[PDB]
């Protein structure tokens, strides 16, 4: 089901939901896939995460123009790393309103990234404060606690069986938790389990660096994270 578009890949997950995939070569290691989401909600499109680069992100918008041909109302980006926020300038050039965790916006400059235009904040239990996420339609944004990064956030899609763990969640057969350089090793396991508890009905778990999986991605990730503490 993978549709090639230039150097990117697009996969329809549900009637109005597509996964976007972009790649960054790393000498000595390999080309790393990063996944985000595209959601049609009525007469607009919503984006979750940029691609690694501005050019790649502009290609996502080109795909949306060709395949959906509706305005992109907003994007939400799920932490201040290159795979999630590397293409912010491309969104802004296109006139797209952008949203991120307040802390992501705070950290973005020092990470060599451009901040989103708008900051999300979260209730104590981790649900986004709804007034900070206007017009998010079916996107349900949840801060599961610090894990992959301190600022990592997650997104469920109402009307679907899909929840997006971003770089918090790895697939059920993953051999590691990837890049832990900015991780909270104490809180990771609890944060993974909190993601699963936030979206208990989601049967399709989408994530940054693996193809969509069953909820065994959550249990496996949490089990691996237990060993960090
Ligand atoms: Zn990351
Ligand atoms: Zn990542």
What is the CATH code of the structural domain delimited by 2-226?
Answer: 3.60.15.10
Residue 183's Cα: distance from chain center in Å?
A: 16
* CA dist list (Å): 205 to 11, 37, 95, 137: 14, 12, 30, 20
How far is it between the farthest Cα atoms of the chain? Answer: 47
Cα–Cα nearest to 90, from 51, 127, 122, 126? 51
For the chain, what's the residue count?
A: 229
Distance 43 CA to ligand 2 centre (A): 30
Distance 24 CA to ligand 2 centre (A): 11
Sheet holding 154-157, edge to edge: 139-142, 154-157, 162-164, 204-206
Are the beta carbons of 152 and 167 closer than 8 angstroms?
yes
Cβ count near 83 (within 10 Å): 27
Distance 187 CA to ligand 1 centre (A): 16
The contacts of residue 159 (CB under 8 Å, 6+ apart) are: 138
Cβ count near 173 (within 10 Å): 10
Cα–Cα nearest to 221, from 177, 185, 179? 177
Q: What is the DSSP letter of 95?
A: T
Burial profile 18-55: b = 16 or more Cβ within 10 angstroms, e = fewer: bbbbbbbeeeeeeebbbbbbbbbbeeebbbbbbbbbbe
* Structure tokens given for 112: 């060599």
Instruction: List the chain domain ranges.
Output: 2-226
Label residue 4 left, alpha or beta by phi (over 0 means left) and psi (-120 to 50 means alpha): beta
Are the beta carbons of 147 and 192 closer than 8 angstroms?
yes
PDB experimental method: X-ray
Please give the sequence-ordered ranges of beta strands (E in DSSP) within 146-213, or none if there are none: 154-157, 162-164, 204-206
Are the beta carbons of 104 and 80 closer than 8 angstroms?
yes
* CA dist list (Å): 78 to 46, 61, 100, 175: 14, 18, 6, 23
Q: Is 49 annotated as a binding residue?
A: no
Q: What is the DSSP letter of 164?
A: E
Distance 35 CA to ligand 2 centre (A): 9
N-term to C-term CA, the chain: 39
For residue 155, the number of C-alpha atoms closer than 13 Å in the C-beta half-sphere is 29
* CA dist list (Å): 58 to 88, 128, 168, 227: 10, 28, 25, 39
């Amino acid at each position: 089901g993978d549709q090639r578009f230039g150097d990117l890949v697009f996969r329809q997950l549900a009637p109005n939901v597509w996964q976007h995939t972009s790649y960054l070569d790393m000498p000595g290691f390999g080309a790393v896939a990063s996944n985000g989401l595209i959601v049609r909600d009525g007469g607009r499109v919503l984006v979750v995460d940029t691609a690694w680069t501005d050019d790649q992100t502009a290609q996502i918008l080109n795909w949306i123009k060709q395949e959906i041909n509706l305005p992109v109302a907003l994007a939400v980006v799920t932490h201040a790393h290159q795979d999630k926020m590397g293409g912010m300038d491309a969104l802004h050039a296109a006139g797209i309103a952008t949203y991120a965790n307040a802390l992501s916006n705070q950290l973005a400059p020092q990470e060599g990234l451009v901040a989103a235009q708008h900051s999300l904040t979260f209730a104590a239990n981790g649900w986004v404060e709804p007034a900070t996420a206007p017009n998010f339609g079916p996107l349900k944004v949840f801060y599961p606690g610090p894990g992959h990064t301190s600022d990592n956030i997650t997104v469920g899609i109402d009307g679907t069986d899909i929840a997006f763990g971003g770089c918090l969640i790895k697939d059920s057969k993953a051999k590691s938790l990837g890049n832990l350089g900015d991780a909270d090793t104490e809180h990771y396991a609890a944060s993974a389990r909190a993601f699963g508890a936030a979206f208990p009905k989601a049967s399709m778990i989408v994530m940054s660096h693996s193809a969509p999986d069953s909820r065994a991605a959550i249990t496996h990730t949490a089990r691996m994270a237990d060993k960090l503490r």
